[PDB]
């Protein structure tokens, strides 16, 4: 499985990715991913049990969640893999990401409604069902709520952080995981959700297919971090209340641990990933 930069997909790869995503939606399988995500968003808390978010397992949890989704796509079309969106490089509304042959663009100004691309409500193919805001059409406001996406220089300063995570292992932590997740620092992953707007700014953010491309790049940045810091590894490593330790299993699956997900190459590679070097 090779995960490719979205900017580099061929027309045929874009077409097959879109068709596979729409088939998961038509068959009812897609919306269960949205629901699982929102349940963890609402249940993960800084002072209590936390698994998918605001915790060291944010990264292995999303890696396995994206694996579940990619395997569902491959059960529809075995050639499709998740692409990633390098929002540090493809940072404007003119990125081919946002073209009508891929994800469609920004929402119109009155109601945020996306009006083009395969996921526009007018196609009849992308009902928003699992939702909190009662409207049932895909919405976006690219750059509406926050002026700019992270830059490469900002990403680099987070990749330079040596410690994977630090007590208290939550949204107040210093360390790589929380700077990437974004709750401290210049904010990488959370800022991108804010920048897209619409459902992506909510706990039901997988309603927007860009969710998967964003998280595939967050996942790639973890891989890059490991290359930068081969000497540093997941923490904590046992006996931490409310937090998933290295060799503890993770909900919802219960059959997988952070330890089983540290090495992505057991499941996929990237089109390009620098190896370790000074």
């Amino acid at each position: 499985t090779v995960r490719k930069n979205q900017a580099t997909l061929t027309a045929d790869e874009k077409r097959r990715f879109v068709a596979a995503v729409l088939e998961l939606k038509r068959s009812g399988r897609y919306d269960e991913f949205v629901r699982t995500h929102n349940e963890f968003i609402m249940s993960d808390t800084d002072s209590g049990e936390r698994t998918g978010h605001r915790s060291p397992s944010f990264l292995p949890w999303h890696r396995r969640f994206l694996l579940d989704f990619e395997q569902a796509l491959q059960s529809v079309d075995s050639s499709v893999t998740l692409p990633y969106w390098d929002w540090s490089a493809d940072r404007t509304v003119r990125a081919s990401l946002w073209a009508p042959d891929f994800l469609g663009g920004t929402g119109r100004s009155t109601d945020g409604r996306v009006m083009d691309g395969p996921f526009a409500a007018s196609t009849g193919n992308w009902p928003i069902n699992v939702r909190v805001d009662s409207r049932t059409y895909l919405r976006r406001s690219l750059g509406g709520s926050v002026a700019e996406l992270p830059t490469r220089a900002e990403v680099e300063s987070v990749l330079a952080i040596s410690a994977y995570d630090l007590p208290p292992y939550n949204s107040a932590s210093e360390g790589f995981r929380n700077h990437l997740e974004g709750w401290r620092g210049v904010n990488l992953h959370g800022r991108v959700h804010v920048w897209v707007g619409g459902q992506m700014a909510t706990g039901v953010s997988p309603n927007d297919p860009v969710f998967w491309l964003h998280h595939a790049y967050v996942d790639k940045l973890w891989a890059e971090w490991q290359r930068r810091h081969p000497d540093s590894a997941y923490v904590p490593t046992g006996g931490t209340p409310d937090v998933v330790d290295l060799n503890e299993t993770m909900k919802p699956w219960n059959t997988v641990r952070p330890a089983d997900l540290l090495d992505h190459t057991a499941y996929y590679t990237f089109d390009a990933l620098e190896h370790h070097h000074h």
Binding site: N38, E39, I41, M42, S43, D44, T45, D46, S47, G48, R54, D111, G112, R131, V132, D133, S134, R135, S145, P168, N170, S171, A172, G182, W183, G190, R191, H193, V194, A201, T202, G203, V204, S205
Partner: protein, 78 residues
């Protein structure tokens, strides 16, 4: 210490807050009588499920952010 309660009409909608599939969170917010899931972060900021990635200082700020996000739409219960 829980925040104080509040009740106001904000952009035409009734928003309320009070100390009290999701976390057991010690504060409840309502938009036009429908409860809105909200959460407090370790630094004392708040978020809501319709503006989850954008911390604001208080539960009323979260309720107001939800009314802004909704653009007039009814909330659905969680």
């Amino acid at each position: 210490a829980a925040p104080e309660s509040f009740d106001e009409v904000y952009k035409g909608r009734r928003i309320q807050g009070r100390p009290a599939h999701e976390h057991g969170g010690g504060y409840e917010v309502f938009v036009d009588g429908v409860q809105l899931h909200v959460m407090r972060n370790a630094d004392g900021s708040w978020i809501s499920v319709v503006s989850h990635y954008d911390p604001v200082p208080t539960p009323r700020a979260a309720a107001r952010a939800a009314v802004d996000e909704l653009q007039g739409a009814p909330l659905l219960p969680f």
